[PDB]
Design a protein around this ligand. Structure first.
Ligand SMILES: O=C(c1nc2n(n1)[C@H](c1ccccc1)C[C@@H]2F)C1CC1
Ligand SMILES: [Br-]
Ligand SMILES: [Br-]
Ligand SMILES: [Cl-]
Ligand code: NA
Ligand code: NA
Ligand code: NA
Ligand code: NA
Ligand code: NA
Ligand code: NA
Length: 269
């Protein structure tokens, strides 16, 4: 389905920024309020078309943009509701996630990124907080930071509006000139891989941001010995392949899928 021009009145009053919302006739949804301030109707057509463009990225592992709210002095994006929150919340839950499910999660992240890259989309902000999980532990990739919503991100920072580095490729640390590439996303995926088996964030011993940044650029990586549960040797090799310093030596997501899928099916599923 295409993007719906929804209205603020469509949602139940819950006055008392991604939050849960209840559409009067459609049910639970996620709302990201982006702008609240003076009237800026000059940008409406530009904001709507960008939402239409983003809404065209349709894939089983990509979150759906259900609608937009474009009113006088109020602009919001309305997104599919993923009941279980983000991947890091799932990994830290009291109930353990079995290896078969972790393998499926990895495969689905690969499928989603292969789709996005095939559409010429570079995510640039891939991390557990942008990987959302539904009731059945299937995942969908999101862009909650608006890294790909150029127009909406600019709106979010217009001053008249009232309203992590662990997964960033080293070529981007301490460097604003560096333009992210598909290979930047592959590096982020490598660290997500580590997090999936560590059940936590990397670099817990880092003491200072400058220490952490200079260390990673010098070759430091998440502590593979820190994984406490069983992590298949193939997956350790995979993450090492994906966080290699030379970006052009990192594989593609289709290349990752070609070797991970048959391994998932014979060992993990
Ligand atoms: O997080 C959001 C969101 N909305 C959409 N996605 N994420 C998908 C997507 C994923 C990765 C890269 C680009 C788009 C396509 C869809 F339009 C909304 C709340 C801001
Ligand atoms: Br090299
Ligand atoms: Br593999
Ligand atoms: Cl394949
Ligand atoms: Na599915
Ligand atoms: Na990061
Ligand atoms: Na730090
Ligand atoms: Na390296
Ligand atoms: Na295959
Ligand atoms: Na398969």
């Amino acid at each position: 389905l295409n993007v719906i021009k929804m209205k603020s009145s469509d949602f139940l009053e819950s006055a008392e920024k991604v939050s849960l919302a209840f559409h009067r006739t459609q049910g639970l949804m996620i709302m990201k309020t982006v702008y609240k301030g003076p009237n800026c109707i000059e940008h409406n057509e530009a904001l709507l078309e960008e939402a239409k463009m983003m809404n065209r990225l349709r894939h089983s592992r990509v979150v759906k943009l259900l609608g937009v709210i474009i009113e006088e002095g109020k602009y919001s994006l309305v997104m599919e509701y993923m009941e279980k929150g983000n991947l890091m919340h799932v990994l830290k839950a009291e109930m353990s996630t079995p290896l078969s499910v972790k393998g499926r999660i990895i495969l689905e992240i690969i499928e989603g990124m292969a789709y996005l890259h095939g559409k010429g989309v570079i995510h640039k902000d891939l991390k557990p907080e942008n990987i959302l999980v539904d009731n059945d532990f299937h995942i969908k990739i999101a862009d909650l930071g608006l890294a790909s919503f150029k127009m909406w991100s600019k709106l979010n920072n217009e001053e008249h509006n009232e309203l992590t580095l662990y997964y960033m490729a080293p070529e981007h640390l301490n460097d604003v000139n560096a333009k992210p590439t598909e290979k930047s996303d592959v590096y982020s995926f490598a660290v997500v891989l580590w997090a999936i088996f560590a059940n936590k964030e990397p670099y817990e011993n880092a003491i200072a941001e400058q220490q952490l940044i200079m260390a990673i650029k010098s070759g430091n990586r998440p502590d593979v010995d820190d994984i406490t549960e069983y992590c298949p040797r193939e997956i350790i090799s995979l993450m090492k392949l994906c966080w290699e310093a030379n970006p052009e030596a990192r594989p593609t997501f289709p290349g990752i899928e070609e070797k991970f899928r048959p391994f998932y099916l014979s060992q993990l599923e």
